[model samples]
Target: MSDLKVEQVLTSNEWQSTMVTVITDNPLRRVNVESNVKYLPNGDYIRVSNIKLFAQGESTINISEKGRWEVSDNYLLVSPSEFKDISSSKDFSEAQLRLITQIFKLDAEQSRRIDVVNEKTLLLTSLNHGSTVLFRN
Candidate 1:
């Protein structure tokens, strides 16, 4: 069988890495009740604490439909409507909450974290330790 991989935000840098993937240990290693970072049963998400992209200094985040979140360029926007229930990456399967979706992009990189403040603002930052993926049989 072939190996399927997932891309995750790194805790080390601002640039995305095309060189790694991860099989998450969901539920997480530690619990930070105060962090904006949420750990799901399958996937893990961390609210980027270092940056904030606001729409004219407002709380709402705005990401570009033109591109993913990034450290540079203009404020890439995501709408308030796009915030779905955060789920675990481990629960990401072909069944359950996992629907029929194919993993595209033979090569993938860590996209910036998009934290929507409302309908207008967002923040993007690089991580320190990124996700790791392996191919095995």
Candidate 2:
């Protein structure tokens, strides 16, 4: 396990989808939601929030209401303590819709690589099936 302190609000930021590919066969070979990943760091532990937004529409996805997160060498895990449906909707969005996939389950145990390409750009991998690009606001 690694104690990498990553605390960014995925929802508060806007990331653009560039490409999506399935290195392996999976149900979510292509997901269009992007977000700002948040971490709560105290002496106790860490927590991650799903402050994510949708691509083709005006909506936000909260994967986990709240919980502790685990970090590995190449990936991070943000799984809710239990089974719960993450909710969605925003000021300029439609009403929440229930999907077969739970919010937390979308990328619960997925590990993504983050690269600060420049002062105004960020590269997030694995979140998209391929590579994702984000620009600073």
Candidate 3:
């Protein structure tokens, strides 16, 4: 049995996502999303993500989120307080921004199961979505 002491291991290091897979329809699709999370010792966390969405064409969105995080049992819970658009391109419409905000706002409340493979590798699995494997950077 693996007893992950996530509290001790999750702080003071920046974790960058190496792989992200989301179930689109019948098959699993790999999305182009780069995410980095830095967890502070005081239970605060900062997450920066850059995602490329294919709508009419390719659109890039960069988002920065500040939140609080904690570990309970084997789960990591996050509550986001703020989300900012850090993208250099301001071509997104109001509707696009609204939809993106709604999605992330709901996603920020999800609790993920933590799997600590090593000191440098971490896995976060969400029941509703998929798993995100990250490495310390």
Candidate 4:
């Protein structure tokens, strides 16, 4: 018999059923995200503690008024220019990298940097008008 360990599982019960498993025989270790919360502007941090109760769902921050960003899960929908500005802010690089390492942690996990590429229409213009940046590393 095989010792199957379903350490983690997420399923999408749609028409049929779709599921994803994160398994390990070695009782998957959990991370302490509190110590790893990334610093934001005003020396604040975006963490699970900051979760607010909104009329709709829950979130930390948002560009629009409805959606929100949070530590558990989030969606980043902003132009690269905005991202560049945000990322370029004082201590943002360190904070960003720290945040990245906090998530998807691996053996000596490292954070990836963001780079800008040119688009035809915004070829010569500032990057603020071109691509939208996703928050990863």
Candidate 5:
């Protein structure tokens, strides 16, 4: 599993579904995401928070608007580019990473490596600790 694999999945699917599964012993903390995806014609996909709402054919929120995907086979970069005003800001990396994750509804933290089991399933490892989430759509 590598960033290339993850990118492959992203390129193939217009819609994606994901669920976070914590592998750590800490029971109090966990992440959750509703499994639903709707692709837009503008080369972006929305991470649906409510499957029922999406299925009802109502207006759904698009979360990936800020995620400017800078592709790389080794890493997935999404945030302020170099020489930008916010690039030198403190905690910028962490903050941008979190924002990107939230926008895309992913479990990754620091690492961009992702495993694609198939065209319909994707496995993304957590950057913080022991956790591996599967995204199926």
Candidate 6:
């Protein structure tokens, strides 16, 4: 059984997921991603991610984003305002990069269903894409 306030889950600790498989379509084959998200009490959040793509060739990219977040009912909404590609490989084409970015959701607003499995585990299911991300605090 799980019974914890969303406030407790958001502010108590930083949430992280490691080497999670990312679902992708045609040209952009397979992806594995790791993410770290920190939610501040003031409604600001920061997300850092490391992504590996096994498309035409192997390439890795790192990105950092800052955004605003809020919980409405059982949904978590986020609007990312800043994005930085910390590092990227030249092996990726523009199309590949764009596809990868879209898959990882780096540049848009998102609303996800929040499922707090336990005090230490969290799940966010993308309302638009049906992608689920798991995190641990």
Q: Report the C-alpha lDDT of model 4 over 1-137, residue by residue, as the tens digit.
A: 11111001101110111111222324222221211122232222222211111221121211111111111111122111111112112223545445533332321121222232322111112123222121211
Q: What TM-score would every model get versus the actual structure?
A: 0.17, 0.41, 0.78, 0.16, 0.42, 0.78
TM-score, predicted candidate 1 vs. hidden true structure: 0.17
Question: Quick one: RMSD of model 3?
Answer: 3.7
Q: How far is candidate 4 from the true structure (C-alpha RMSD, Å)?
A: 20.2
Which scores greater on lDDT, model 1 or model 6? 6
**Ordering by lDDT:** 3, 6, 2, 5, 1, 4
Which predicted model would earn the best lDDT? 3
Name model 3 segments beyond 4 Å from true: 1-4, 18-31, 55-57, 89-93
Q: In model 2, which runs have C-alpha deviations exceeding 4 angstroms?
A: 1-31, 43-64, 82-100, 131-137
Per-model C-alpha lDDT, please? 0.23, 0.44, 0.72, 0.20, 0.40, 0.72
Q: Given candidate 4, what's the lDDT at residue 136? A: 16
* lDDT-best of 4 and 5: 5
Better of 5 and 6 by lDDT: 6
Tens-digit lDDT track for model 3 on 82-108? 989887844568687667657756766
In order of listing, the candidates' clash counts read 29, 7, 0, 1, 0, 0
- Give the per-residue lDDT digits (tens) of candidate 2, residues 1-137: 12353334333344343323332342222334444434544312223234333333234444433456654553444555543445633543233334414433555445566666775576657754455565655
lDDT for each residue of candidate 1 in 1-137, tens digit (9 for 90 to 100): 11111122221222211222232334212211111322222323323211111222111111111113222222212211122333223322335222211121111133433443332222433254332221111
Q: Report the number of backbone clashes for model 4.
A: 1
Q: Give per-residue CA lDDT, model 6, range 20-51, as digits (tens).
A: 55456544566777788888988899989887
